[PDB]
């Protein structure tokens, strides 16, 4: 019949409890320990410069108003009891759209302790903005952060720390990004000062390295094949005006179509990407190849042999310079 | 044991408090000071003529009903206490879809003061409509505004002012638009009169200058290269009927594809954009080039030399006129 005794204890704790007042109101700030259990990173969008993160956000703090005696157990209460308890106003500064799962009930956990320690866990799917430097794209490396901060309480009223040191954030190995690999993650604790006051800040950052395997097949290889295709016109006899002209035109038109497709999948950034430089270089070679026959046709009404060695050599030299610069 | 004393003070303030009545009801209007801390501008959509804005909206006003004595501190209460307090009915007139973040709790701040001053902060992501003049697109300059107004209370009951003068709105430097640059921002205070009455209005406007770097590579450069490509037919001998005809056709077809792609990314405006004028001009040159050979073929069954100098000169003249007019 301990359930009645437990019910009396819980009702005693909530009798006179004021959710409007933080623990130790008017006194020392309350320290809040935070751990993150990463579930997965669903998407990493370059166009929107944001990523989708699902995680188990857990907060640890002590409230002496909830301390109970005589029960040597950790009371795991229903998630609906959190509405009658004070919780930190933790929010994500760089998020764009976030929500808490509510099937079959709200993904929320409350676990009291005899000494007054309160455990508060939430399963949150968040979309956090991440500015990306696409100058070295697609060979770029990105650093996406997750800013954690209190909204109303300043450093004089609340403090944030990573519970467990560098082991606070787990589940990093669970991240399976087809396009990126988690090189490293860091935990940063700092205080950020605004006009209203100074607020505690916790930062979680991942360094992402893009995988080049997809882009070699999708973009680089088709561009090289078109450039090699234009070189076929050199071996064709000069009298075949229709064939050589058609070969030069089609390669140029195909190069434009490839260039248009790539830029549609990326945000309208003003600076030139690394992939754009390669496409521009490939366009130069095919354009020069068509101009090469125009010079041949003009003088005719040896040059082809000279072009048969310069173009493959120059293109090979261009590739060597391009890859070494960006690797 | 000041928490009990604070709890008694707060309960005393809310005892008999009527949220339905504004402060100083029936008397002088209550002045509300507003500051905006811009977080970021996520998107600027030309097709929908709107932009997405995330900001920290803070309201400052004094309510003598909430004045307390004996506590020389600023009471930072839980965000859930705002439901028992009167707040201004501030809304955005030109917004299309807005919401208040609620992870892990509602992004809301309440901070009372001993003299009755109340601080109310909200983190709001809003999508505000912004009509755009695309006549000079993509070399255009846009002026997007954010209208702030009370919904129910007229100027006789409430007044709005920018708290801090021109420093009310901060975080403008945080705006990182890949396609636009924040030239200037202005703060405007005015009274707008409707049938129901006159209402206070606060306006926040940004002047955006579009970056031309992306459009030069995406649209202008491919069009120029196609136009230069058509000029190659001039050096080709007239007897190569298949080659010269194919060169003229493919350039014309490619120009159409480029024109179609650009207009799909923009709203169906009736007036002609600056970029449309350039594409139409480029289409004229390539169309005339194909017509040039048709005249040559007709007379044959010198003209090419005269076309080799007129077309590059006319196109260069067209570019000089085009750029000077729009710069």
């Amino acid at each position, epitope marked *: 019949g301990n359930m009645s005794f437990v019910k009396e204890t819980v009702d005693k704790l909530l009798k006179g409890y004021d959710i409007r007042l933080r623990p130790d109101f008017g006194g020392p700030p309350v320290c809040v320990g935070m751990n993150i259990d990463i579930a997965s990173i669903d998407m990493v969008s370059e166009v929107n410069m944001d990523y989708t993160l699902t995680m188990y956000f857990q907060q640890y703090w002590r409230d002496k108003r909830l301390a109970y005696s005589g029960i040597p157990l950790n009371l795991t209460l229903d998630n609906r009891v959190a509405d009658q308890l004070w919780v930190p106003d933790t929010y994500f*500064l*760089n998020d764009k759209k976030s929500f808490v799962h509510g099937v079959t009930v709200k993904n929320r956990m409350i676990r009291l302790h005899p000494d007054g320690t309160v455990l508060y866990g939430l399963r949150i799917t968040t979309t956090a903005a991440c*500015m990306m*430097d696409l100058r070295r794209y697609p060979l770029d490396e990105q*650093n996406c*952060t997750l*800013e954690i901060e209190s909204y109303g309480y300043t450093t004089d009223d609340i403090e944030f720390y990573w519970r467990g040191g560098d082991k606070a954030v787990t589940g990093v190995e669970r991240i399976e990004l087809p396009q990126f690999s988690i090189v490293e993650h860091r935990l940063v604790s700092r*205080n*950020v*000062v*605004f*006009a209203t006051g100074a607020y505690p800040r916790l*930062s979680l950052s991942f360094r992402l390295k893009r995988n080049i395997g997809y882009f070699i097949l999708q973009t680089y290889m088709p561009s090289i094949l078109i450039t090699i295709l234009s070189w076929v016109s050199f071996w064709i006899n000069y009298d075949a005006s229709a064939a050589r002209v058609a070969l030069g035109i089609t390669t140029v038109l195909t190069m434009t179509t490839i260039n248009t497709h790539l830029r549609e999948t990326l945000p309208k950034i003003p600076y030139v990407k690394a992939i754009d430089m390669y496409l521009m270089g490939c366009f130069v070679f095919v354009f020069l190849a068509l101009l090469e026959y125009a010079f041949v046709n003009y003088i005719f009404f040896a040059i082809d042999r000279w072009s048969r060695i310069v173009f493959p050599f120059t293109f090979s030299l261009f590739n060597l310079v391009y890859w070494l610069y960006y690797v | 044991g000041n928490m009990s004393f604070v709890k008694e003070t707060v309960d005393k303030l809310l005892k008999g408090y009527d949220i339905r009545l504004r402060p100083d009801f029936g008397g002088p209007p209550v002045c509300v000071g507003m500051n905006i801390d811009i977080a970021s501008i996520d998107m600027v959509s030309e097709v929908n003529m709107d932009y997405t804005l995330t900001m920290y909206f803070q309201q400052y006003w004094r309510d003598k009903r909430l004045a307390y004595s004996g506590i020389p501190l600023n009471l930072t209460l839980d965000n859930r206490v705002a439901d028992q307090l009167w707040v201004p009915d501030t809304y955005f007139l030109n917004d299309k879809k807005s919401f208040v973040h609620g992870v892990t709790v509602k992004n809301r701040m309440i901070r009372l003061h001993p003299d009755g001053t109340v601080l109310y902060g909200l983190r709001i992501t809003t999508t505000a409509a912004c009509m755009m003049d695309l006549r000079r697109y993509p070399l255009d300059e846009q002026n997007c505004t954010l209208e702030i107004e009370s919904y129910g209370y007229t100027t006789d009951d409430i007044e709005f002012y920018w708290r801090g003068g021109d420093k009310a709105v*901060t975080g*403008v*430097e*945080r*705006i*990182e*638009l890949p396609q636009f*640059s*924040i030239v200037e921002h202005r703060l405007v205070s005015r009274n707008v009169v409707f049938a129901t009455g006159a209402y206070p209005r606060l306006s926040l406007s940004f002047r955006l200058k579009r970056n031309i770097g992306y459009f030069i590579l995406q649209t202008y450069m491919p069009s120029i290269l196609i136009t230069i490509l058509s000029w190659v037919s001039f050096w080709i001998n007239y007897d190569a009927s298949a080659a010269r005809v194919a060169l003229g056709i493919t350039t014309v077809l490619t120009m159409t594809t480029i024109n179609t792609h650009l207009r799909e990314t923009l709203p169906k405006i009736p007036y002609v954009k600056a970029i449309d004028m350039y594409l139409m001009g480029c289409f004229v040159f390539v169309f005339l080039a194909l017509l040039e050979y048709a005249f040559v073929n007709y007379i044959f069954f010198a003209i090419d030399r005269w076309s080799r100098i007129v077309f590059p000169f006319t196109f260069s003249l067209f570019n000089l006129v085009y750029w000077l007019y729009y710069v």
Partner: nanobody
Amino acid sequence: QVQLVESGGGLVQGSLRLSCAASGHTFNYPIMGWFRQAPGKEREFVGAISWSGGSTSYADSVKDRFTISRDNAKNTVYLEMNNLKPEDTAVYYCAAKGRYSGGLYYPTNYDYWGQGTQVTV
């Protein structure tokens, strides 16, 4: 990791142009600020500017007198001090701020600082 070096101080009786060169992971720190610290007085915010967009802010004391501009080619942020006054006698520092590091006017929000240049009038 950003390294900041500033130069162009000296002593004058006038117009002076300070400069600050940055190197490293500049993308993570797109905001550059200028600070001065009078002897005994706390460090004072002068002006801030973003690497991209050229948006700038200034303090009331130095408003309409000091102009701040940067060139991304040299990764250099330069402060042009005109109509110098005896109040402008302090060590001028160059600082960089993170993307989500808060307000410009607070020096503690900046991570990397320069050694400092002495300007006396």
